[PDB]
Design an enzyme around this catalytic site. Sequence first.
Site: not given
Ligand SMILES: */C=C\C(=O)Nc1ccccc1Nc1ncc2c(n1)N(CCc1ccc(NC(=O)C=C)cc1)C(=O)N(c1cc(OC)cc(OC)c1)C2
Length: 296
Positions: A160, A164-165, A178
Amino acid sequence: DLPLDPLWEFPRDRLVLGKPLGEGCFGQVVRAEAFGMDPARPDQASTVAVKMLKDNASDKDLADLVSEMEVMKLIGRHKNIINLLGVCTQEGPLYVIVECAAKGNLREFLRARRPPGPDLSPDGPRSSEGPLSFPVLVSCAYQVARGMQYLESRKCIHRDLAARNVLVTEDNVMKIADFGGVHHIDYYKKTSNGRLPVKWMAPEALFDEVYTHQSDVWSFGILLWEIFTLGGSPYPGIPVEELFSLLREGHRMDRPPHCPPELYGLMRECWHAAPSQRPTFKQLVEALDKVLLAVS
Ligand SMILES: */C=C\C(=O)Nc1ccccc1Nc1ncc2c(n1)N(CCc1ccc(NC(=O)C=C)cc1)C(=O)N(c1cc(OC)cc(OC)c1)C2
Protein backbone atom coordinates in the site's frame (compact mmCIF):
# COMPACT_ATOMS: atom_id res chain seq x y z
CA ASP A 1 -1.79 -17.37 26.20
CA LEU A 2 1.10 -15.92 24.22
CA PRO A 3 4.68 -17.17 24.52
CA LEU A 4 7.16 -14.91 26.35
CA ASP A 5 9.91 -13.37 24.25
CA PRO A 6 12.51 -11.89 26.68
CA LEU A 7 14.26 -10.27 23.73
CA TRP A 8 11.24 -8.05 23.10
CA GLU A 9 9.03 -8.13 26.22
CA PHE A 10 8.67 -4.74 27.97
CA PRO A 11 6.96 -4.36 31.36
CA ARG A 12 3.59 -2.72 30.72
CA ASP A 13 3.74 -0.73 33.94
CA ARG A 14 6.61 1.20 32.36
CA LEU A 15 4.10 2.68 29.90
CA VAL A 16 1.80 5.61 30.42
CA LEU A 17 -0.80 5.58 27.65
CA GLY A 18 -1.65 9.00 26.24
CA LYS A 19 -3.32 10.64 23.24
CA PRO A 20 -5.01 8.40 20.63
CA LEU A 21 -3.28 8.83 17.26
CA GLY A 22 -6.20 7.41 15.29
CA GLU A 23 -7.27 4.19 13.63
CA GLY A 24 -4.28 2.02 12.76
CA CYS A 25 -4.94 -0.82 10.29
CA PHE A 26 -5.10 -3.68 12.74
CA GLY A 27 -6.16 -1.92 15.91
CA GLN A 28 -5.81 1.52 17.42
CA VAL A 29 -2.63 3.46 18.06
CA VAL A 30 -1.92 5.59 21.08
CA ARG A 31 0.98 7.95 21.86
CA ALA A 32 2.64 6.91 25.16
CA GLU A 33 5.50 7.59 27.54
CA ALA A 34 7.90 4.71 28.17
CA PHE A 35 10.34 4.65 31.08
CA GLY A 36 13.55 2.75 30.60
CA MET A 37 13.11 1.66 26.98
CA ASP A 38 16.89 1.96 27.12
CA PRO A 39 17.68 -0.50 29.94
CA ALA A 40 20.81 1.52 30.73
CA ARG A 41 18.61 4.49 31.60
CA PRO A 42 15.74 2.80 33.52
CA ASP A 43 14.12 6.07 34.62
CA GLN A 44 14.46 7.93 31.32
CA ALA A 45 11.20 8.94 29.60
CA SER A 46 10.74 8.59 25.84
CA THR A 47 7.71 9.08 23.59
CA VAL A 48 6.58 5.95 21.79
CA ALA A 49 3.60 4.75 19.76
CA VAL A 50 1.56 1.78 21.01
CA LYS A 51 -0.70 -0.31 18.81
CA MET A 52 -3.40 -2.36 20.59
CA LEU A 53 -6.63 -4.25 19.77
CA LYS A 54 -9.77 -2.13 19.30
CA ASP A 55 -12.66 -2.61 21.76
CA ASN A 56 -14.57 -5.90 21.38
CA ALA A 57 -12.09 -7.30 18.85
CA SER A 58 -12.41 -10.78 17.27
CA ASP A 59 -9.99 -13.70 17.53
CA LYS A 60 -9.01 -12.77 13.96
CA ASP A 61 -8.09 -9.20 14.94
CA LEU A 62 -5.80 -10.71 17.59
CA ALA A 63 -4.27 -12.97 14.93
CA ASP A 64 -3.65 -10.00 12.61
CA LEU A 65 -1.96 -7.87 15.28
CA VAL A 66 0.16 -10.81 16.50
CA SER A 67 1.30 -11.47 12.92
CA GLU A 68 2.16 -7.80 12.44
CA MET A 69 4.22 -8.06 15.65
CA GLU A 70 6.06 -11.12 14.40
CA VAL A 71 6.78 -9.46 11.04
CA MET A 72 8.37 -6.49 12.84
CA LYS A 73 10.53 -8.78 14.93
CA LEU A 74 11.83 -10.39 11.73
CA ILE A 75 12.53 -7.44 9.42
CA GLY A 76 15.13 -5.90 11.70
CA ARG A 77 16.09 -2.27 12.09
CA HIS A 78 16.48 0.53 9.55
CA LYS A 79 16.57 4.34 9.69
CA ASN A 80 13.73 4.78 7.20
CA ILE A 81 11.13 2.45 8.62
CA ILE A 82 9.02 2.48 11.79
CA ASN A 83 11.00 0.19 14.08
CA LEU A 84 9.74 -2.19 16.75
CA LEU A 85 10.77 -1.11 20.27
CA GLY A 86 9.03 -3.73 22.36
CA VAL A 87 5.89 -5.67 23.23
CA CYS A 88 3.62 -6.41 26.17
CA THR A 89 2.15 -9.87 25.80
CA GLN A 90 1.92 -11.05 29.41
CA GLU A 91 -0.68 -10.46 32.11
CA GLY A 92 -2.73 -7.88 30.25
CA PRO A 93 -3.77 -6.59 26.82
CA LEU A 94 -1.51 -7.03 23.79
CA TYR A 95 0.66 -3.97 23.17
CA VAL A 96 3.03 -3.49 20.21
CA ILE A 97 5.38 -0.62 20.98
CA VAL A 98 7.03 1.21 18.08
CA GLU A 99 8.80 4.44 17.27
CA CYS A 100 6.71 7.62 17.38
CA ALA A 101 7.35 10.19 14.65
CA ALA A 102 6.79 13.71 15.89
CA LYS A 103 5.45 15.30 12.72
CA GLY A 104 2.78 12.76 11.63
CA ASN A 105 2.38 11.33 8.13
CA LEU A 106 4.11 12.59 4.99
CA ARG A 107 0.89 13.62 3.21
CA GLU A 108 -0.27 15.86 6.06
CA PHE A 109 3.30 17.12 6.56
CA LEU A 110 3.40 18.32 2.92
CA ARG A 111 -0.15 19.73 2.83
CA ALA A 112 0.47 21.80 5.98
CA ARG A 113 3.67 23.30 4.48
CA ARG A 114 2.35 24.50 1.15
CA PRO A 115 3.69 27.90 0.14
CA PRO A 116 1.71 31.07 0.85
CA GLY A 117 -0.31 32.18 -2.19
CA PRO A 118 -0.29 35.84 -3.23
CA ASP A 119 -3.00 36.34 -0.66
CA LEU A 120 -1.19 37.70 2.41
CA SER A 121 0.88 40.87 2.88
CA PRO A 122 4.66 40.81 2.36
CA ASP A 123 5.88 40.77 5.96
CA GLY A 124 9.62 40.14 6.24
CA PRO A 125 12.35 39.34 3.69
CA ARG A 126 11.03 35.79 3.19
CA SER A 127 7.32 36.43 2.65
CA SER A 128 7.16 34.24 -0.47
CA GLU A 129 9.57 31.56 0.77
CA GLY A 130 7.60 28.46 1.84
CA PRO A 131 8.86 25.87 4.32
CA LEU A 132 9.55 23.32 1.61
CA SER A 133 12.48 23.61 -0.80
CA PHE A 134 13.34 21.37 -3.78
CA PRO A 135 16.31 19.59 -2.14
CA VAL A 136 14.25 18.67 0.93
CA LEU A 137 11.43 17.21 -1.29
CA VAL A 138 14.06 15.18 -3.12
CA SER A 139 15.45 14.03 0.24
CA CYS A 140 11.99 12.82 1.28
CA ALA A 141 11.79 10.83 -1.98
CA TYR A 142 15.31 9.44 -1.55
CA GLN A 143 14.69 8.33 2.06
CA VAL A 144 11.49 6.49 1.15
CA ALA A 145 13.35 4.72 -1.66
CA ARG A 146 16.13 3.69 0.77
CA GLY A 147 13.53 2.37 3.22
CA MET A 148 11.78 0.44 0.44
CA GLN A 149 15.12 -0.93 -0.75
CA TYR A 150 15.79 -2.21 2.76
CA LEU A 151 12.32 -3.71 3.04
CA GLU A 152 12.79 -5.41 -0.37
CA SER A 153 16.15 -6.85 0.76
CA ARG A 154 14.19 -8.46 3.60
CA LYS A 155 11.74 -9.99 1.14
CA CYS A 156 9.03 -7.60 2.31
CA ILE A 157 6.37 -6.31 -0.09
CA HIS A 158 4.46 -3.29 1.17
CA ARG A 159 1.36 -3.38 -1.09
CA ASP A 160 0.00 0.00 0.00
CA LEU A 161 2.93 2.37 -0.35
CA ALA A 162 1.51 5.89 -0.17
CA ALA A 163 2.48 9.22 1.48
CA ARG A 164 -0.18 8.67 4.19
CA ASN A 165 1.82 5.55 5.12
CA VAL A 166 5.13 7.31 5.58
CA LEU A 167 5.74 9.07 8.92
CA VAL A 168 7.99 12.12 9.50
CA THR A 169 10.28 12.53 12.53
CA GLU A 170 11.26 15.72 14.33
CA ASP A 171 14.35 15.78 12.12
CA ASN A 172 12.37 15.23 8.88
CA VAL A 173 13.51 11.64 8.56
CA MET A 174 11.05 9.47 6.57
CA LYS A 175 9.84 6.24 8.15
CA ILE A 176 7.80 3.77 6.18
CA ALA A 177 4.83 2.42 8.15
CA ASP A 178 2.71 -0.73 7.95
CA PHE A 179 4.88 -2.87 5.69
CA GLY A 180 3.56 -5.95 7.45
CA GLY A 181 -6.62 -8.77 2.53
CA VAL A 182 -5.75 -8.50 -1.14
CA HIS A 183 -8.52 -10.90 -2.20
CA HIS A 184 -11.33 -8.64 -1.04
CA ILE A 185 -10.44 -5.02 -1.71
CA ASP A 186 -13.44 -2.73 -2.18
CA TYR A 187 -11.96 -0.72 -5.11
CA TYR A 188 -14.65 1.95 -4.55
CA LYS A 189 -13.73 2.27 -0.88
CA LYS A 190 -13.06 5.86 0.18
CA THR A 191 -11.31 6.20 3.55
CA SER A 192 -12.61 8.58 6.24
CA ASN A 193 -10.05 11.16 5.07
CA GLY A 194 -11.26 10.76 1.50
CA ARG A 195 -8.46 8.57 0.14
CA LEU A 196 -9.08 6.06 -2.66
CA PRO A 197 -6.35 3.42 -2.18
CA VAL A 198 -7.01 1.84 -5.60
CA LYS A 199 -5.17 4.87 -7.07
CA TRP A 200 -1.86 3.57 -5.69
CA MET A 201 -2.23 0.01 -7.02
CA ALA A 202 -0.12 -1.28 -9.90
CA PRO A 203 -2.13 -2.58 -12.92
CA GLU A 204 -1.02 -6.15 -12.29
CA ALA A 205 -2.15 -5.90 -8.64
CA LEU A 206 -5.45 -4.28 -9.47
CA PHE A 207 -6.29 -6.37 -12.56
CA ASP A 208 -4.53 -9.69 -11.83
CA GLU A 209 -4.09 -9.68 -8.02
CA VAL A 210 -0.34 -10.06 -8.56
CA TYR A 211 2.03 -8.23 -6.16
CA THR A 212 5.80 -8.04 -6.51
CA HIS A 213 8.50 -5.56 -5.51
CA GLN A 214 7.93 -3.95 -8.91
CA SER A 215 4.27 -3.40 -7.87
CA ASP A 216 5.60 -1.31 -4.98
CA VAL A 217 7.77 0.57 -7.47
CA TRP A 218 4.58 1.62 -9.28
CA SER A 219 3.17 2.83 -5.97
CA PHE A 220 6.48 4.61 -5.28
CA GLY A 221 5.94 6.54 -8.49
CA ILE A 222 2.53 7.62 -7.26
CA LEU A 223 4.15 8.66 -3.93
CA LEU A 224 6.72 10.64 -5.92
CA TRP A 225 3.82 12.51 -7.49
CA GLU A 226 2.29 13.18 -4.07
CA ILE A 227 5.57 14.70 -2.89
CA PHE A 228 6.05 17.01 -5.84
CA THR A 229 2.44 18.13 -5.66
CA LEU A 230 3.05 18.74 -1.92
CA GLY A 231 0.46 16.20 -0.86
CA GLY A 232 -1.94 16.23 -3.83
CA SER A 233 -4.53 13.50 -4.44
CA PRO A 234 -3.52 11.40 -7.45
CA TYR A 235 -5.66 11.17 -10.64
CA PRO A 236 -7.42 14.41 -9.61
CA GLY A 237 -11.16 14.46 -10.31
CA ILE A 238 -11.18 10.93 -11.65
CA PRO A 239 -13.75 8.65 -9.99
CA VAL A 240 -12.88 4.94 -9.65
CA GLU A 241 -15.09 3.82 -12.56
CA GLU A 242 -13.23 6.11 -14.90
CA LEU A 243 -9.84 5.10 -13.41
CA PHE A 244 -10.41 1.46 -14.47
CA SER A 245 -10.93 2.31 -18.12
CA LEU A 246 -8.26 5.02 -18.20
CA LEU A 247 -5.75 2.50 -16.83
CA ARG A 248 -6.88 -0.06 -19.40
CA GLU A 249 -6.16 2.60 -22.05
CA GLY A 250 -2.71 3.24 -20.55
CA HIS A 251 -3.51 6.70 -19.14
CA ARG A 252 -0.90 8.30 -16.88
CA MET A 253 -0.97 11.43 -14.69
CA ASP A 254 0.33 14.72 -16.17
CA ARG A 255 3.56 16.36 -15.14
CA PRO A 256 2.70 18.51 -12.15
CA PRO A 257 3.63 22.23 -11.96
CA HIS A 258 7.04 23.20 -10.57
CA CYS A 259 8.28 19.66 -11.06
CA PRO A 260 11.54 19.20 -12.99
CA PRO A 261 11.55 16.79 -15.92
CA GLU A 262 14.07 14.62 -14.05
CA LEU A 263 11.44 13.81 -11.46
CA TYR A 264 8.44 13.45 -13.78
CA GLY A 265 10.79 11.25 -15.80
CA LEU A 266 11.29 8.90 -12.82
CA MET A 267 7.48 8.87 -12.22
CA ARG A 268 6.76 7.75 -15.78
CA GLU A 269 9.47 5.08 -15.45
CA CYS A 270 7.76 3.75 -12.31
CA TRP A 271 4.48 3.53 -14.24
CA HIS A 272 5.76 1.57 -17.26
CA ALA A 273 3.22 -1.17 -18.08
CA ALA A 274 5.72 -4.02 -17.87
CA PRO A 275 7.05 -4.49 -14.31
CA SER A 276 10.53 -5.42 -15.64
CA GLN A 277 10.60 -2.04 -17.39
CA ARG A 278 10.23 -0.09 -14.13
CA PRO A 279 13.33 0.84 -12.13
CA THR A 280 14.28 -1.29 -9.15
CA PHE A 281 14.38 0.43 -5.74
CA LYS A 282 18.19 0.16 -5.91
CA GLN A 283 18.12 2.09 -9.20
CA LEU A 284 15.68 4.64 -7.71
CA VAL A 285 17.95 5.25 -4.70
CA GLU A 286 20.90 5.78 -7.07
CA ALA A 287 18.98 8.09 -9.41
CA LEU A 288 17.55 10.16 -6.59
CA ASP A 289 20.99 10.25 -4.94
CA LYS A 290 22.42 11.84 -8.08
CA VAL A 291 19.77 14.56 -8.05
CA LEU A 292 20.18 15.09 -4.30
CA LEU A 293 23.97 15.45 -4.60
CA ALA A 294 23.63 17.72 -7.63
CA VAL A 295 21.45 20.16 -5.65
CA SER A 296 23.01 20.08 -2.18
C1 LIG B 1 5.32 10.91 18.31
C2 LIG B 1 4.32 12.02 18.62
C3 LIG B 1 3.01 11.83 17.83
O1 LIG B 1 1.95 11.63 18.37
N1 LIG B 1 3.07 11.91 16.40
C4 LIG B 1 1.89 11.74 15.61
C5 LIG B 1 0.81 12.59 15.70
C6 LIG B 1 -0.28 12.36 14.85
C7 LIG B 1 -0.27 11.30 13.96
C8 LIG B 1 0.82 10.46 13.88
C9 LIG B 1 1.90 10.69 14.71
N2 LIG B 1 3.09 9.91 14.73
C10 LIG B 1 3.16 8.51 14.56
N3 LIG B 1 4.38 7.96 14.67
C11 LIG B 1 4.53 6.63 14.51
C12 LIG B 1 3.36 5.84 14.23
C13 LIG B 1 2.11 6.46 14.11
N4 LIG B 1 2.06 7.81 14.29
N5 LIG B 1 0.97 5.72 13.82
C14 LIG B 1 -0.35 6.41 13.74
C15 LIG B 1 -0.53 7.13 12.40
C16 LIG B 1 -0.82 6.10 11.30
C17 LIG B 1 0.18 5.79 10.39
C18 LIG B 1 -0.07 4.87 9.39
C19 LIG B 1 -1.32 4.25 9.30
N6 LIG B 1 -1.49 3.31 8.21
C20 LIG B 1 -2.72 3.13 7.46
O2 LIG B 1 -3.75 3.73 7.75
C21 LIG B 1 -2.70 2.12 6.31
C22 LIG B 1 -1.59 1.38 6.10
C23 LIG B 1 -2.32 4.55 10.21
C24 LIG B 1 -2.07 5.50 11.22
C25 LIG B 1 1.06 4.35 13.62
O3 LIG B 1 0.08 3.69 13.36
N7 LIG B 1 2.29 3.74 13.73
C26 LIG B 1 2.56 2.32 13.56
C27 LIG B 1 3.30 1.99 12.41
C28 LIG B 1 3.66 0.67 12.18
O4 LIG B 1 4.43 0.36 10.97
C29 LIG B 1 5.11 -0.93 10.99
C30 LIG B 1 3.29 -0.32 13.10
C31 LIG B 1 2.54 0.02 14.25
O5 LIG B 1 2.13 -0.96 15.19
C32 LIG B 1 2.69 -2.25 15.07
C33 LIG B 1 2.18 1.35 14.48
C34 LIG B 1 3.42 4.42 14.04
